[PDB]
Ligand binder design. Structure first.
Ligand SMILES: O=C(O)c1cc(C(=O)O)c2c(n1)C(=O)C(=O)c1cc(C(=O)O)[nH]c1-2
Ligand SMILES: O=C(O)c1cc(C(=O)O)c2c(n1)C(=O)C(=O)c1cc(C(=O)O)[nH]c1-2
Ligand SMILES: [Eu+2]
Ligand SMILES: [Eu+2]
Lengths: 576, 576
C-alpha cells in the first residue's frame, strides 16, 4: 500500500502491528536511550474495558492512537493532542458469543490495521470490519469465518495495495486454514487461498517452487494426506503477515495439520501445514512454499512472523526471510525463492538432531515422535514451541535478533480423534513442564540471537515464558513485558536490565514506541494476562487436572502463574 | 476494638476505610508535601480482576495491603516486602448471581475491615465473611441479607470491640433497613437494630433522646407512618460507620423511607428514615437519633459519613459529629446528645430555606416538594445529593473539611408504586441535569468548608461530579480522583492543583496514604468508573431513555461521561 510504504518510514509513527511490512519491530527513535532510560515513568494509562489476554499493540497514525481489546473486541481512537488524550471514538461489534466456546487459546486479538483513512479489525466470531478512521463509523463488514464450524479469528489483518488480508483460527477444531483478500473500499472478496486441498483451492502460480521442486509442488495439498484427511487439515493462518513490495510477495506461516493424533495423518507430509508461504497479493497465487515440519506430531504451528531483513550471507547482501519457529529452529531463507540458507536451534531441541542441508528436512529423533496410545516423554520444545506468537525484533544497527522464548518440555500421547463440526478435533493428552526435560527452574528467556551463526549472543532467564514481542530502538534498548507484570528495558549490547516497573497484570502485549504531537518519545504496552500459557488465569481453571488447556493448566500452576498475576486490560504509556 | 484503637494512631497504617474510628481520613504523614508533590510518580499497580465501580480503598495493616474489587468481590492480600509486592493470598466468595439484578446503583463494594488477625468482607449477595488475614482461609460466613427480598450489601463493615457491624441496601426495593452485629470469632449474630417498626426492633435505650424529646421517641418507628407502610420503610444502612470509644457510641445514617412516592407515606415523619443514629455497640440500643429529612420526597438518603472531630464551639472544646448530607446541608451535632449546633448548605439548596432553629426541622419551600402524578421541576440538589457516599475528610491542623460534591438538579414526579418482593419499589420518574436549574456547565466541585461558620472557604469546579473521598495529610495536601480518570493533589490552603495524572478509568475510589516496609510514603487509589452517576458506563445503558438508572443515564450522557471514560479495575500506587 503506497501510503503505508511512506508512513512506515516515518520514525514517530507505528502504523502496523510489527512497525513495518518487513516486521522488524525496530524504531529509529533515540530520545530514550541507555544513558537516560532509568528516568522513564508512567505518563498516562487507558483501560481497554475488557479482561483476559491483551495481545498485539496499539497503532499510532498521525496524532491518533488506535487501541483494541480482548473479546468482545472494543476498538478506540485516542486523540493524542488532548493532553494527554481524549477518546475520539469507540466501536464494539455485535458478535455471536458462541465464539468464546470455540477459542482454543484465550479470547485474544492481535490487533488493528490502518490504510487510506480506514481502520480494519477482526472479531473472534469471524468478521472482518472496516471503520472510518476519523469517525469510527462502520463502512463495511464481511463474515470471513464460521463459529459453528469451530472457526474464530484472532490474528491481525494486513493491508497490501487495495486489499486487506485476513486469516482464520481453528487448527484444534479441524478447520481448513486459508487467507482471504478483501477490497479495502467495498469489502468484496477477491481471492481465497487454502493451505491444503486441490491446487484449485491452494492457488499455485505457474512458477511455484520452480527453483526448489524438492520443497513440493502441484498435488501435494491432497496427495501428502491419507484418504481425504486434508478436509480437516488445519494449516490455519492466525500469525503475523509480512510483505516485500519490491518482489510483490507477501509471506505467512500455517498451523498444525489438524488432529494432534499423527497416526490419523500417517503416510505423508500433510502439506501445506507447518509451512512458510510466499504469495502474490493481486491473485493469492503461491510463488514458493517451504514446509518446516512435515507430518507434525507436536503441534508445532508454523505461524510465527516472517521478518524480512537484508543480511550478509557468505559476504553477499541477500534479501532474507527469518523465522523463529515453534519447532525450535531459527530459519533463514532467501525470500525470492524459498532457498534454505540456515536453520539452527534457538532453544534446546531434542525432537530433531538438525535440519539437513542435504534435503532441507528435519533429521528426526524417532523416540521423540509421538504416537497413538503410547506416551512420548520429554519432548523439547513443548507444543507452545521455542516461541509462540509473540514476535521477535531485528536491529539493522547490530544485525541481530531479539527474541522472546519459552523454556519448556512435555509428555504427549496421541489418542484417536473423532470429528464433530463445532467441537474440538484434537486427539492428544499433553503434560507440560520446565525445560531440559523438567530439570530447569525457569520457563522462559529473552535472548539476543545471531541467525546465520545460530548463536545465542546473550540470554536473560525469565521465570515465566516471555509472551511479549519486543520493540528495539536506535537508543540501544529493547522493551518487553513478563507474565507476572514486569515491563523491562534492556541494554541490547550487554543484556542488562536498565529499567523496570511492575504493572497490574501479566503482559502479553507487544510494546511500541512513537512520537506524540508534542514531539516527545513515548513507549506504550498492553497489560492483561492470558493467551495459551495464561489460560488457567484468564479462564479461572483449577489445578485438579494438569492435562487441561492441552497441558497449559498443569505447567502454569507448576510455574506459579496463578499466584503471580490477576486478569486485567490496561494500556500503559511511558515517557522520560 | 483495643487493637484498632492502637493501630489507627500509627501514621504508616490505614487499618479501616476512613483511617480511624472518627472517619477523619487524615494522615499525619508529611514525607509528601506541597513542596515536593510535583515529583510524585507511579511506583506500581495491581489489577483487581473486575470491571465496573471500584469504591472504597485498600487497607494497609503491618506490611500487608488488602485489596477488594467490585462484584464478584475478589479479595487480595499483597505482601509489600516483596519489591514492590507479591500476591500473598486471594479469595473470591461463591455468590448468588441474582444479586446483580437487585443492585440499584452498580455492583460496588465499599471495602474490607480488619481486626484481631482477620479480614471481614461483605458480598453483594448479602454475606458477611471472616478470613484469616495471614492465609486467606475462610473462618466463618453468615447470611445477613436476602437477595430474594431485593436486599444487597455494598457497605463496608466496621469492627467495634468483639463485634463486626454490617448494614444492608435496598431502599429502592422496600427493604427494612437495619444494622446487625456479629461476633468476630464465631460469626454468631448478637443483635439487629432496625430503622423503623416497633421499639423492640428499633432498639431504644432507656435514655433515648432524653435531652431532645423534640427529636422523637418511643413508638415513632410506627406512629409516624400511615398504616403499616413502615414494613416497606427503607432506612437502609449502606454508608460509613463511626465510633467514639470514650462515649461507647457508634454512629451511622439511614436511607430514604422506601417508596419514592411520598403520597403513599403521607401523614407523618416516616421515622427513622433519613436519620443520624447513635447506638451502644454492646446491645445495639439507641442513645439518640436525629431525623434530617422528615417525610422525604427527594430520595435524600441520610447515609453519608458521621465524622467525629473535637471542635471549638463558642470557645469550648466540644465532641462533635459532622455530616454532609445528601439533602445539601452540612450538619454539626453534639455527638453526646444529638444537639444541633449548626446546619447550613454546603451546596446550592432550593428545596428548603433553612433548618429551623426552633424545632430542627427543614423549613420547606412548598413548590419543591414532590407529588404523585405531577412533575416538580428544578429541585437542587438532585437525588444524588449535595454529595453522595464519597466521604469527606477533616484536618485537625486547619479545623476545616475537604468535601467532594455534586452540582446537579432534577425534575421529579411521584408515581403510584406497587410492592412485589424482589422487584423495585420506587414510584418516581426523575430527570437529572446540571446545577442551578440546568444553568451550569459543570456537574461537580471539590470544596474546603468551614462547618461551624457554615461557609465555603474555596471551591474547585469540576466537570463531573466528584465521586472520590479525599485523603488529607499533614503535608498540606488533599488527594482525590475525578470521573474521567484524573488523580489530583491540591493545596489544602488554596485549592491549587499541585500535581495530577490521567489514569485508565474514572476514579470512584477513596485514596489512602501509608508507609511501606521501606519506610517510604505511598499514595494509593482505585480506578474503575461506576457507582450511580457512572451506571450508564458500568452497565452499558443507551442514551435513548434518560429516565433510566433513576435519572442517572440522562445526566451522565449530558455531562459526556460515556465519551470520557471506559470501565476498568486497577489499583495505582504512587511515591516520590
Ligand atoms: O491452530 C490454531 O488455529 C491456533 C490458533 C491460535 C489462536 O488463534 O490464538 C493459537 C494456536 N493455534 C496455537 O497452537 C498456540 O499455541 C497459541 C497461543 C496463542 C496465544 O494467543 O497465546 N494462540 C494460539
Ligand atoms: O437506598 C439504598 O439502599 C441505596 C443503596 C445504595 C448502594 O447500596 O450502593 C445507594 C443508594 N441507596 C442511593 O440512594 C445512592 O444515591 C447511591 C449511590 C451509590 C454509589 O455507590 O455510587 N450507591 C447508592
Ligand atoms: Eu495450533
Ligand atoms: Eu436510596
Amino acid at each position: 500500500n503506497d501510503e503505508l510504504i511512506k508512513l512506515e518510514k516515518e520514525p514517530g509513527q507505528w502504523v502496523m502491528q510489527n512497525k513495518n511490512y518487513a516486521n522488524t519491530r525496530y524504531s529509529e527513535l533515540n530520545q530514550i536511550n541507555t544513558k537516560n532510560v532509568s528516568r522513564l515513568r508512567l505518563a498516562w494509562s487507558f483501560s481497554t474495558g475488557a479482561l483476559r489476554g491483551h495481545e498485539g499493540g496499539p497503532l499510532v497514525v498521525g496524532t491518533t492512537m488506535y487501541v483494541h481489546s480482548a473479546y468482545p473486541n472494543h476498538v478506540y481512537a485516542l486523540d493524542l493532542t488532548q493532553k494527554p488524550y481524549a477518546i475520539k471514538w469507540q466501536y464494539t461489534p455485535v458478535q455471536n458469543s458462541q465464539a468464546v466456546a470455540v477459542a482454543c487459546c484465550d479470547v485474544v486479538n492481535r490487533g488493528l490495521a490502518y490504510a487510506n483513512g480506514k481502520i480494519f479489525m477482526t472479531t473472534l466470531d469471524g468478521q472482518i470490519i472496516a471503520l472510518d478512521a476519523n469517525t469510527g463509523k462502520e463502512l463495511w463488514k464481511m463474515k470471513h469465518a464460521d463459529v459453528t464450524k469451530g472457526e474464530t479469528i484472532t490474528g491481525a489483518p494486513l493491508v497490501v495495495k487495495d486489499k486487506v488480508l485476513v486469516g482464520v483460527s481453528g487448527g484444534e477444531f479441524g478447520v481448513r486454514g486459508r487467507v482471504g483478500a478483501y477490497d479495502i473500499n467495498t469489502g468484496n472478496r477477491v481471492w481465497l487461498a487454502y493451505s491444503q486441498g486441490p491446487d484449485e483451492e491452494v492457488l499455485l502460480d505457474s512458477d511455484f517452487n520452480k527453483e526448489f521442486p524438492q520443497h513440493g509442488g502441484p498435488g501435494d495439498g491432497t496427495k501428502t494426506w491419507p484418504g481425504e484427511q486434508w478436509k480437516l487439515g488445519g494449516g490455519t493462518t492466525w500469525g503475523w503477515y509480512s510483505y516485500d513490495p519490491a518482489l510483490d510477495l507477501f509471506y505467512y506461516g500455517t498451523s498444525n495439520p489438524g488432529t494432534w493424533n499423527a497416526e490419523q495423518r500417517k503416510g505423508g507430509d500433510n502439506k501445506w501445514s507447518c509451512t512458510i508461504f510466499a504469495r502474490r497479493p493481486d491473485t493469492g497465487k503461491a510463488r514458493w512454499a517451504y514446509q518446516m515440519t512435515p507430518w507434525d506430531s507436536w503441534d508445532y504451528d508454523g505461524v510465527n512472523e516472517m521478518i524480512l531483513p537484508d543480511l550478509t550471507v557468505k559476504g553477499k547482501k541477500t534479501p532474507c526471510l527469518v523465522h523463529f519457529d515453534r519447532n525450535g529452529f531459527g530459519y533463514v531463507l532467501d525470500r525470492r525463492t524459498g532457498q534454505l540458507i540456515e536453520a539452527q536451534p534457538f532453544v534446546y531441541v531434542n525432537w530433531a538432531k538438525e535440519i539437513s542441508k542435504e534435503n532441507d528436512r528435519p533429521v528426526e529423533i524417532p523416540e521423540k515422535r509421538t504416537k497413538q496410545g503410547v506416551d512420548t516423554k520429554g519432548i523439547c520444545p513443548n507444543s507452545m514451541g521455542g516461541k509462540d506468537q509473540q514476535p521477535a525484533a531485528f536491529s539493522p544497527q547490530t544485525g541481530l535478533f531479539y527474541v522472546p522464548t519459552n523454556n519448556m518440555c512435555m509428555n504427549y500421547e496421541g489418542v484417536e480423534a473423532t470429528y464433530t463440526a463445532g467441537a474440538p478435533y484434537v486427539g492428544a493428552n499433553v503434560l507440560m513442564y520446565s525445560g531440559h526435560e523438567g530439570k530447569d527452574d525457569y520457563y522462559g528467556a529473552f535472548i539476543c540471537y545471531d541467525a546465520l551463526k545460530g548463536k545465542r549472543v546473550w540470554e536473560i532467564h525469565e521465570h515465566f515464558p516471555v509472551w511479549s514481542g519486543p520493540v528495539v530502538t536506535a537508543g540501544g534498548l529493547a522493551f518487553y513485558g513478563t507474565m507476572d507484570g514486569w515491563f523491562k528495558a534492556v541494554d541490547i549490547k550487554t543484556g542488562k536490565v536498565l529499567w523496570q516497573q511492575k504493572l497490574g497484570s501479566g503482559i502479553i502485549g507487544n510494546p511500541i514506541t512513537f512520537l506524540g504531537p508534542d514531539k516527545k518519545q513515548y513507549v506504550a504496552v498492553y497489560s492483561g494476562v492470558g493467551g495459551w500459557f495464561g489460560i488457567a488465569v484468564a479462564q479461572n481453571l483449577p489445578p485438579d487436572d494438569p492435562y487441561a488447556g492441552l497441558g497449559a493448566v498443569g505447567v502454569a500452576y507448576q510455574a506459579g502463574l496463578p499466584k503471580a498475576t490477576t486478569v486485567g486490560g490496561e494500556l500503559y504509556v511511558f515517557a522520560l
